[PDB]
Amino acid sequence: QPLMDNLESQTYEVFEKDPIKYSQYQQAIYKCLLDRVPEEEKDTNVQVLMVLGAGRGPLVNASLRAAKQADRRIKLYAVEKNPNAVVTLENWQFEEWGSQVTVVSSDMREWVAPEKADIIVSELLGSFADNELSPECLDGAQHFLKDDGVSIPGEYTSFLAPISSSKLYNEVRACREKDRDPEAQFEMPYVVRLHNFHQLSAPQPCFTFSHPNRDPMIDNNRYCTLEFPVEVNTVLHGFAGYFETVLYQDITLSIRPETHSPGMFSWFPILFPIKQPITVREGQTICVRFWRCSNSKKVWYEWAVTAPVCSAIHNPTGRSYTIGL
Amino acid sequence: QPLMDNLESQTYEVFEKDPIKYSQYQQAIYKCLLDRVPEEEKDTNVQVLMVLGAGRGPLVNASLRAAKQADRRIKLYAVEKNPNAVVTLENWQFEEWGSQVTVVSSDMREWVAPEKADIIVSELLGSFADNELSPECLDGAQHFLKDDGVSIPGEYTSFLAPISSSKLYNEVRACREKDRDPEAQFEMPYVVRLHNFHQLSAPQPCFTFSHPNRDPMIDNNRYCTLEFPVEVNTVLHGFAGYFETVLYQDITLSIRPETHSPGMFSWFPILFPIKQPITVREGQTICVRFWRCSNSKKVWYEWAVTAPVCSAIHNPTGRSYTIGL
Amino acid sequence: PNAPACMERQLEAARYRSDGALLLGASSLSGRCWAGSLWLFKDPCAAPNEGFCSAGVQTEAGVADLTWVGERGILVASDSGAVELWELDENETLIVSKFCKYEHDDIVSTVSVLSSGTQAVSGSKDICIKVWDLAQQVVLSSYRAHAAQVTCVAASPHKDSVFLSCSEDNRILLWDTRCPKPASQIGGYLPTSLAWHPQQSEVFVFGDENGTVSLVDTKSCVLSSAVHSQCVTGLVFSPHSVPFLASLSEDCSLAVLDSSLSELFRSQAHRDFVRDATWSPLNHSLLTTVGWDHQVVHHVVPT
Amino acid sequence: RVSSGRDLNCVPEIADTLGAVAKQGFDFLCMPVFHPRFKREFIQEPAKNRPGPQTRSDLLLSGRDWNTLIVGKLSPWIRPDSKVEKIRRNSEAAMLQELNFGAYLGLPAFLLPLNQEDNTNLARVLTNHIHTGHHSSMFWMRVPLVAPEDLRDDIIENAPTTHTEEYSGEEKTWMWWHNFRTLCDYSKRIAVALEIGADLPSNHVIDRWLGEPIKAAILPTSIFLTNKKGFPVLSKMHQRLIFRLLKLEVQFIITGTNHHSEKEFCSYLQYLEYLSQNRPPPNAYELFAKGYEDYLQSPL
Ligand SMILES: Nc1ncnc2c1ccn2[C@@H]1O[C@H]([C@H](O)c2ccccc2)[C@@H](O)[C@H]1O
Ligand SMILES: Nc1ncnc2c1ccn2[C@@H]1O[C@H]([C@H](O)c2ccccc2)[C@@H](O)[C@H]1O
């Protein structure tokens, strides 16, 4: 939860070990800069680029590399709310970047920008796309993007697939802790490298977000019904979650198994367990319902299986799991 | 917690059964109106009065009675965030009040006022004065009060006194609930009509707030050290909490036993328990430390006894008790 | 000028010598390297521009305090625990190390040259006060009188055995090294700065952590004023026959006070902590301040 | 055999310092995470808006080095229990800042002083950091056997040192520790970094620390005696305390400057190794019970 919590130096170090992810962001910025500045305006047109959630600086470096290969002029702002990462950024700014980069130690939702941006670049995505609260963050930052401005990523979609794993069911079961609801461990997602499991139906899209958001008052709350055809006799233990994102045009990133991005390995699927295992016969359909809920303080998911049998609604009112705003 | 929760119709009904409280508010508004409008300006000067947290309308009625007895002209706004109470207010506005009263269904911290106020009137006080978050609420409403504007109440102070009660200690002990820290019941205050107890030292002032607040960035967080002389052999079980408020000038309200307001009975003391009872010998001093803490989401108290022996710090980081913002 | 290419951001000290040349002390309190530097500006109006200094040198660690030792010597209180003595070459184009003695067990916070100019006193976070012989490069005496960090040590203007010290243990001590028990306690908020009166032998001023400036006479009641909103970092008397008193604070202001401690001048030119003030020996109404905002400000004080 | 660290308050270059310290034979370095003199403002303008990096970059060392070789130290100006409200508030914000940076770096331990009777607000701020995120790091409370006020030279004419026995009075620093850890509710992450002075107190003061979670013993170079050859050694009484601490498997910390100037620095550490090698070999019971010390088991 990089919003509610300040990530540790080694966490940012693991993110940065992905060479493919940032070469994709660089390609997206490079194409965008070319589409926004014609060759004749090369030396007069300075594009205002804002890295929103800059961490320890990889997207700042990706933006600079992109501007050099596009042979275009950029003015960068690196916005970061984690003051510990701001130390890394300010040391990079003094030693290497210089005046071209303005480091801002602020929450993007509170920052009074001194200028409007041409492009906002961010990497606020979780294993279930919107689970790190990228929609809320970019919604609050939206007012400082120019009317014709571009957000990278432009869009993202989460995916769900029913899974069978008596091994993982037992693993979740063992997460009972003292001084909390004895069944809370089943009402929360887990980032897990799913190994001993059976995918029971093809992943289907769950929730989609688009940036910039031009549907007044936005409403990031969602309700989705998914019907999964099952061709085997099995036992349902939960839902695997994945995502896809459009950085710019055809430049994308994905952890969906069937369209998985080349060499992008720090990213594991998410698992939504169910309290009671569900017997599924060949030819039956698994119907799941997922909600994205919120108040002014927290965002959470609630979920229920309605076919072949009903489950209880899991995580009502975020009683077991919430994502801090 | 009238901020985090919407009070029930019967709760507002119990508040309204106090005839003395509102005749005190009426006297405070009456004196303020006379001090702000000279006799010669009687028919030209319309004072803008805002009732902030209007409930079911008693302070609106108190303001109107005050303006009639002062023979002054008023323009009223009744601001209320509870939409259920807003139903009572809007039915009163249509049937009786009319155009003189503008009912606003809003949080006072978000309301874009169309005019600035001469007087802001509120009754946002708990048994420990600031425990219903009156400082935070009035701080956010401050920007729509004129530069020479008056807030009723102008000030409030909480008081603490050490108490002995093996009866109440056992009562708190029996509040252990499933699925929470087994000692959480000792790390939270209770509103209680203290009966079988011994007050071990005279109440001493704890925290003070003044409205309007003219100390930039305010800082409602506080840290207080209190030293209580004890003239008896006893056992310390907790701290009784009370408060006093200055509505306007000499017009006050108090639940402090020694200065208790005449016939104001819906208001019981608050009790801060301690996990482990503390033996106190005659002539020893009880030293207590109280903190008022917050983040952007919650406000809480933390407390510790440091003499004659140390206790653990109670409610660290609001782990057992918080007041929602 | 055969000196470091860039001086560190945090200016710690500024002192004019008899001819009007300005000695600056600086440290880098942030970034990769935490060192310091010493600079001489024969043209003080060019300060802090490196390419316009007369001499400059890099020290191994930060400069917490410094002082002139005559006209060519420079005594430094280092972060390393060492008391250093540097000396200007005969051409005054180089600053050469004469001694670096690591005698303190923590940061040396304060340094002061005694009347003779042959001895000095150092105070440290290690709680000790040391008396040094500058020629033999040795500690003559080591005193552990305080019970917390030594904040400030100040040598008497004309008595070579007398100095003042103050500390986080809430003690102001008057020392006289001719006594078997050399310290004596002078009778709220922690004392943070000291300045002996340049004309009145038994009179001194002291600043505290709460912004108050106080006038004290060794005999006895004290005259005081709430001059600053934060800690009083330094107190420097002017060279005039009837001196003015410059006071500087972590509140980023400079105040110039009279005999009765009433304010005559106030400057809010600094954007960070004001660290030192020095009065020009050439023009007595010019007072120079240095701060962590990397500004060398030359104030015209109304006399 | 003996795990030892170097305590420094001056680190001009982090890579060069660590190398010199490792070459001397030390296993770790206790050092400031922010410059110890770099006082910071969080509330009042213009100083609260001070630009530039607030400290040095985490990129200066590998994650493994931050995780295993560096013990953080709280800045000496941070006074959460100051009588001045402004200092108290800036100190709370600075303490939370420094602790959060240590957690960011993944430091194995962080040093905090207990140098006065009232550390109520320091305990409050520490308890609050402990109940916020990553729960791995250790907090070493730097507490002396003998308080500085009780070991000062008797050189103040009008303030003589007390020459009377004050049985409970000489045990005052244990009460500083006791109150602090009571306040923090016996957190297993809060331990003692016991600082040893030139002259040891009475046995009752030393025994007061029995059963206490001592994780480190701080030895200032100034407590070391000199032998006929000119090398640093310890008094028989000091050696007797070192042997007791070796049974608790404490990490030793060497603080202060080289006082044996014409005898190199690793000599202090070479002496600790000598004492460690020249100790009574463990008996049949001690060799058998190795691994079971204070390990609770159900009676068969
Ligand atoms: N509302 C906000 N305003 C300003 N910054 C914000 C937010 C919300 C999040 N972030 C920052 O985004 C980064 C991102 O999650 C990230 C994670 C891991 C590696 C690299 C980048 C984190 O560094 C995080 O602190
Ligand atoms: N930030 C806010 N903005 C708008 N209204 C606000 C707040 C916060 C609180 N209130 C309202 O104050 C009333 C008061 O507590 C009260 C309680 C009982 C009887 C009569 C009045 C309640 O009716 C409560 O809903």
CATH 3.40.50.150 residue ranges of chain B are 1-154
How far apart are the CA of B84 and the centre of ligand 2, in A?
Answer: 12
CA distance B86 to D17: 68
How far apart are the CA of B187 and the centre of ligand 2, in A?
Answer: 26
Residue of B nearest to A180 (CA): B179
Return the closest-CA partner of residue C230 out of C287, C273, C294, C276.
C273
Contact C22, C288 (CB under 8 A): yes
Return the closest-CA partner of residue B288 out of B219, B241, B231, B218.
B241
**Residues of B whose CB is below 8 A from A4:** none
Of residues A8, A88, A91, nearest to D106 (C-beta): A8
Number of H helices, E strands in chain B: 6, 16
Give the residues after which the backbone of chain C is interrupted, taking a C-to-next-N distance over 2.5 angstroms as a break.
Answer: 187, 220
B/e letters for A298-310, b = 16+ CB within 10 Å, e = fewer, are: bbbbbbbbeeeee
Distances (CA, A) of D124 to B26, C184, D33, D97: 43, 37, 21, 15
Residue of D nearest to C146 (CA): D152
Whether A contacts D, i.e. 3 or more CB pairs less than 8 A apart, is yes
The domain tally of chain C equals 1
As a whole number of Å, the CA-based R_g of chain D is 20
The dihedrals phi and psi of D123, each to the nearest 5 degrees, come to -60, -45
Catalytic residue among B132, B136, B187, B302: B132
Please tell me the experimental approach by which this structure was elucidated: X-ray
The dihedrals phi and psi of D102, each to the nearest 5 degrees, come to -65, -40
**Residues of A whose CB is below 8 A from B180:** 179-180
Residue type, C228: H
Q: What CATH number has the domain bearing residue C109?
A: 2.130.10.10
Closest residue CA from atom 10 of ligand 2: B53
Return the closest-CA partner of residue A308 out of A242, A240, A233.
A233
Contact C11, C248 (CB under 8 A): no
CATH topology of domain D1-287: TIM Barrel (3.20.20)
The dihedrals phi and psi of B170, each to the nearest 5 degrees, come to -70, -35
Give the domain extent around C95. 1-303
Return the closest-CA partner of residue A121 out of A171, A52, A61.
A52
Contact B179, A179 (CB under 8 A): yes
Work out the minimum CA distance from D288 to partner chain C, whole angstroms: 43
Whether B contacts D, i.e. 3 or more CB pairs less than 8 A apart, is yes
Return the closest-CA partner of residue A184 out of A1, A323, A321.
A321
CA distance B323 to B273: 17
**Residues of A whose CB is below 8 A from D54:** 83, 86-87, 90
Whether B contacts C, i.e. 3 or more CB pairs less than 8 A apart, is no
Beta strand pairing call for A117-121 and A145-152: parallel
Question: Would you call A182 and B182 a contact, using CB atoms and an 8 Å cutoff?
Answer: no
Closest residue CA from atom 5 of ligand 1: A53
Residue B144: count of CB within 10 angstroms of its CB: 21
Q: Name the closest ligand to CA B325.
A: 2
A109 lines ligand 1 (CB under 6 A): yes
Kindly provide the resolution of this structure in angstroms, with one decimal. Answer: 2.8
| Beta carbons within 8 Å of B41's beta carbon, 6+ residues apart | none
Closest residue CA from atom 21 of ligand 1: A55
Closest residue CA from atom 13 of ligand 2: B53
Please indicate if the annotation marks A298 as binding a ligand: no
A247 lines ligand 1 (CB under 6 A): no
CA distance D121 to D84: 13
Which of the listed CATH numbers 3.90.1010.10, 3.90.76.10, 3.40.50.150, 3.40.50.720 matches domain A1-154?
3.40.50.150
CA distance D65 to D83: 39
B51 lines ligand 2 (CB under 6 A): no
Q: Which two tokens stand for residue A244?
A: 């896809």
**Residues of D whose CB is below 8 A from B311:** 182-183
Residue type, C24: L
CA distance B52 to D217: 59
In whole angstroms, what separates CA A259 from the centre of its chain? Answer: 17
Which ligand 2 atom sits closest to the C-alpha of B55? 23
Segment (H or E) for A60 = helix A58-70
Q: Is D182 on the interface with B (CB under 8 A)?
A: yes
**Residues of B whose CB is below 8 A from A297:** 297
Work out the minimum CA distance from D56 to partner chain C, whole angstroms: 5
CATH 2.70.160.11 residue ranges of chain A are 155-325
The dihedrals phi and psi of A144, each to the nearest 5 degrees, come to -100, 10
Contact A92, A66 (CB under 8 A): no
The dihedrals phi and psi of D187, each to the nearest 5 degrees, come to -55, 135
Residue of C nearest to A87 (CA): C31
Binding residues of B for a protein: 15, 123, 132
Q: Which two tokens stand for residue C273?
A: 């902590």
Instruction: Indicate if B96 belongs to the active site.
Output: no
Closest residue CA from atom 3 of ligand 2: B107
Catalytic residue among A16, A39, A123, A227: A123
Please indicate if the annotation marks A123 as binding a ligand: yes
Contact C203, C190 (CB under 8 A): no
B160 lines ligand 2 (CB under 6 A): no
B21 lines ligand 2 (CB under 6 A): no
Residue of B nearest to A296 (CA): B297
CA distance D98 to C52: 38
How far apart are the CA of B124 and the centre of ligand 2, in A?
Answer: 6
CATH topology of domain B155-325: Hnrnp arginine n-methyltransferase1 (2.70.160)
Can you give the three-state secondary structure of chain D, one letter per residue? CCCEEEECCCCCCHHHHHHHHHHCCCCEEEEECCCCCCCCCCCCCCHHHCCCCCCCCHHHCCHHHHHHHEEEECCCCCCCCCCCHHHHHHHHHHHHHHHHHHHHHCCCEEEEECCCCCCHHHHHHHHHHHCCCCCCCEEEEEEECCCHHHCCCCCECCCCCCCCCCCCHHHHHHHHHHHHHHHCCCCCCEEEEEECCCCCCCHHHHHCCCCCCEEEEEEEHHHCEECCCCCEECCHHHHHHHHHHHHCCCEEEEECCCCCHHHCCCHHHHHHHHHHHCCCCCCHHHHHCCCCCCCCCCCC
Closest residue CA from atom 3 of ligand 1: A107
B16 lines ligand 2 (CB under 6 A): no
Which chains neighbour D (Cβ–Cβ under 8 Å, 3 or more pairs)? A, B, C
As a whole number of Å, the CA-based R_g of chain B is 21
CA distance D179 to A67: 59
> Considering only residues 217 to 246 of chain B, which have any Cβ-Cβ distance to chain D shorter than 8 Å?
217, 219, 223, 225
CA distance D30 to D8: 6
CA distance A231 to B224: 68
Return the closest-CA partner of residue D267 out of D229, D217, D215, D218.
D229
B79 lines ligand 2 (CB under 6 A): yes
The dihedrals phi and psi of C60, each to the nearest 5 degrees, come to -65, -35
Contact C12, C64 (CB under 8 A): yes
CA distance C222 to C234: 19
| Beta carbons within 8 Å of D109's beta carbon, 6+ residues apart | D71, D72, D137, D138, D139, D140, D215
Please indicate if the annotation marks A22 as binding a ligand: yes
Instruction: Indicate if A171 belongs to the active site.
Output: no
Interface test with A, best of D14, D66, D104 (most A CBs within 10 A): D104
Contact D196, D223 (CB under 8 A): yes
> Considering only residues 120 to 159 of chain D, which have any Cβ-Cβ distance to chain B shorter than 8 Å?
120-121, 123-124, 127-128, 130-132
Closest residue CA from atom 16 of ligand 2: B55
